[PDB]
Write a protein that binds this ligand. Structure first.
Ligand SMILES: [Mg+2]
Ligand SMILES: [Mg+2]
Ligand SMILES: [Zn+2]
Ligand SMILES: [Zn+2]
Ligand SMILES: [Zn+2]
Ligand SMILES: [Zn+2]
Lengths: 512, 510
């Protein structure tokens, strides 16, 4: 019932006030004056934590710790010693010491170390649970008052902060409260976009940075600095909560210098948003200025085959004379090949890398039972994304760029949303947007644009219209309605309006 | 270069010796005497770490911490304060403080905290690399001296310990040395099994616990204790290293009482090993005693459809009068359904649950490009398995059993191995049974009389071959296509530490 401590020190008799203090706090303390006797004790009994002196006659604390870690690696071990040498600090940290306390140590410092190493996950759960109970009413109130794109960014950031904090907590009732705030936030954001989207295209409108502005406004100033070559990575289909899931992994190689949440253009689909990043033009202007590259929905083949050409035309148009190359990664083998030969690009000013894995992974949830279990909810999907990133050729490419002193620019073209509710469409395959001459649809469920050219979109031919699903709706054809509902319900789809699909990260980092 | 520190304290002028000490160690220090001014600086500038006083006029150190974590949650924050109250310690730990130092603080204690929070992964990499450099020759020596099944279990445990230890090191030479020891271990283990396997079937032989002995020897004594209902989970195709990857997750709900590494029977395939768990009979005895349930390789349909029937016959045969139920989970929906209705099984003595996800996931890497990237190497596969377990209906079922005070028995039928080298065959990629097989003798353990190792046979013509090492049996007819497609895939059925030495775990709910 009591927490058992094994304390190893050659002068353990001189530390009796610490033992008495800890026994008052309900800790059980077992002492040892030599590393070898402590190892025998540790093998016979089940201690919750070990305290070790470094400098002892015979076996050192680091030698003793090494034998105990081999026998029970999950038991935390703390160094409490007079040793102040940095090389001893480094050897102990490197040996996975849970803490290092320099003598004379305050008995409350030992107590802090005990609480931090043994009760932290419980304390974090209780603190987060209590903090959210006191915060949710203020979130709902802030949600009701959001009336601008900057307030939407801040509200989305607040929801994302509580989502990653609450994912681990036991309280299902509170998890459901946050989920209701998320669906209400998406309901208000879809009406905000319906209401202001077209106005953003008017001359000198107050609008956020969008897909077609991204390269000129945020990448070009980094290039003009001319201090470091740039690795510009566009991870297709990266939700903001997916970046937050691997932010601390990337911090081991890159120090975040700038973060700019930006808005993807509509539709939040690759063919439109990703090509607009590389060309710096709206789809209607890409059709007008580059008919040889732009492809409308009705044309067969790949919709993003000419991004290098679009990018080189944008770079030339902006007056830059740089050494730049484009790579599109569609599979493991290609990612690995680019990671292995990255040094060949050392002399480049810009290296653009499109990485498709996360988009293919989001769509695999529709097609594969194994991905349905791996990404059953938003928490599972974040966990799966973090597992991917940590073991990906993309991280190996990022590590190669860090070794060459490259600045890292990490961004995406759009996010994706788990669709839950069907919405009947009649048209002529994307579940969150549809374009065509005579579309039949539910007015309340979609943002309708009857003149696509007003929002920089090509009109296939004069009576063409664009509909964009709002909330968690999926556009389902009446033709085989029950089969579309059954198959596409609870799958990740992008193309329409939501915080997940539209508000996306633009990140700049310096190598460390 | 230079690590940037933001230090917030109302008595920041009294801390100048600490600042000068840190500046000498190449740290850049920015000071602030109030939490609100520190929040303004923290938003405008990119600091690597923040030091905060708890008691300040105006915003407290915990109120300031809370604003700073909301703005940039990835930056470590340390509290440096005179407060010694346990409730302040708890509120700070609960707020995800990286460290908490009580004033008067030794300047070297701050330096330790800086090194531990900012350089630990690099220091751990360097220390682990050197520890393995000084250990690898002793591992090779131990490997050469292994001459028993118990020494194999201990050597496998040692290799698994270093595999997890090394999984993030950069030193290619060391990574290759470990890999070489793993291939050499499977080589020696294959020779050890090729000798010893048949002898283990002789009366009163010194043999390890196998598939057909598992239930009677290790589950039945737990049932005979009679002071907790048992949830018996068989996760199909669970490598020892996959159990080691989620061991600390399961420790949040269950305390490990007993661990018994056991040996799967040959072939290390579900049809044989998993049915032998549930029947407590070798496949040849399952064919003889239950012809209505046992299915040979040539019969179409599911090969593990009658495990509840086999289990109930074993339980009846062992003299047990228990309330028992069997569940086979083949998909997410069924797993979720069992988690949702677990309480209906509260009054049971035994609840057996077969969980197929990990086997389906190992096979998905062969075909799906997305799974090739998620499980490209052994480290990625462990990471993927840990991501799965943490968010699985299986863990929800385990949590439901913990709430009901059930004892947990966690085991598997076999592991799997990443195959790398082809081996020609004519007539599963790790075992083959048939009448008159053509094969490479050096690459397989050959049993020309399958009944001698408790396996079925049709006249003296049929035999079984079991791939050793990382070999995969590729048909001569379509050789180049089999090699190209199945190279670097997870396959089970043959002999390896990964396939054969598997965990049997007993836990008490906490
Ligand atoms: Mg000493
Ligand atoms: Mg103060
Ligand atoms: Zn895309
Ligand atoms: Zn997509
Ligand atoms: Zn199996
Ligand atoms: Zn299998």
């Amino acid at each position: 019932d009591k927490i058992r401590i094994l304390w190893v020190d050659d002068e353990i008799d001189l530390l009796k006030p610490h033992i008495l203090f800890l026994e008052k706090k309900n800790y059980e303390v077992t002492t040892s004056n030599n590393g070898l006797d402590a190892i025998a004790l540790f093998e016979e009994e089940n201690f919750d934590i070990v305290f070790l002196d470094e400098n002892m006659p015979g076996m050192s604390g680091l030698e003793t710790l090494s034998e105990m870690k081999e026998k029970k690696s999950a038991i935390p071990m703390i160094m409490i010693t007079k040793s102040e040498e940095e090389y001893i600090m480094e050897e102990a940290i490197g040996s996975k010491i849970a803490d290092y306390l320099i003598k004379p140590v305050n008995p409350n410092q030992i107590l802090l170390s005990l609480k931090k190493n043994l009760d932290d996950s419980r304390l974090i759960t209780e603190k987060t649970t209590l903090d959210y109970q006191k915060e949710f009413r203020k979130i709902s109130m802030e949600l009701a008052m959001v009336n601008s794109y900057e307030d939407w960014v801040e509200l989305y950031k607040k929801l994302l902060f509580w989502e990653l904090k609450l994912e681990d907590i036991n309280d299902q009732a509170m998890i459901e409260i946050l989920e209701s705030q998320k669906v209400e936030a998406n309901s208000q954001f879809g009406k905000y976009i319906e209401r202001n989207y077209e106005d953003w295209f008017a001359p000198k409108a107050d609008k956020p940075i969008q897909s077609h502005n991204l390269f000129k406004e945020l990448v070009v100033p980094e290039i003009k600095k001319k201090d470091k070559p740039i690795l510009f990575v566009v991870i297709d289909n990266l939700r903001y909560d997916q970046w937050k899931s691997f932010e601390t992994v990337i911090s081991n190689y890159y120090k975040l210098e700038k973060e700019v949440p930006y808005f993807s253009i509509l539709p939040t689909a690759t063919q439109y948003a990703r090509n607009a990043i590389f060309s710096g033009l709206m789809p209607l202007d890409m059709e007008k200025q580059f008919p040889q590259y732009w492809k409308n929905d009705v044309e067969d083949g790949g919709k993003n085959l000419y991004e290098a050409e679009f990018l080189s035309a944008q770079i030339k148009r902006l007056g830059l004379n740089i050494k730049e190359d484009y790579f599109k990664i569609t599979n493991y083998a290609g990612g690995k090949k680019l990671a292995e030969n990255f040094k060949a690009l050392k002399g480049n000013d810009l290296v653009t890398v499109v990485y498709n894995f996360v988009d293919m992974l989001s769509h695999a949830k529709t097609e594969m039972e194994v991905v349905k279990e791996l990404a059953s909810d938003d928490k599972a999907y974040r966990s799966l994304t973090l597992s991917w990133f940590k073991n990906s050729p993309l991280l190996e490419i990022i590590q190669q760029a860090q070794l060459l002193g490259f600045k890292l620019i990490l961004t995406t073209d759009h996010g994706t949303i788990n669709v839950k509710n069907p919405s009947k469409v009649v048209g002529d395959l994307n579940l969150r947007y549809k374009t065509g001459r005579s579309l039949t649809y539910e007015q309340k469920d979609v943002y309708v644009v009857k003149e696509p050219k007003t929002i920089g979109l090509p009109a296939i031919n004069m009576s063409s219209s664009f509909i964009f699903a709002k909330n968690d709706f999926f556009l389902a054809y009446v033709n085989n309605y029950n089969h579309y509902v059954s198959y596409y319900k609870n799958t990740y789809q992008h193309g329409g309006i939501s915080l997940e699909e539209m508000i996306i990260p633009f990140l700049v980092f310096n190598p460390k």
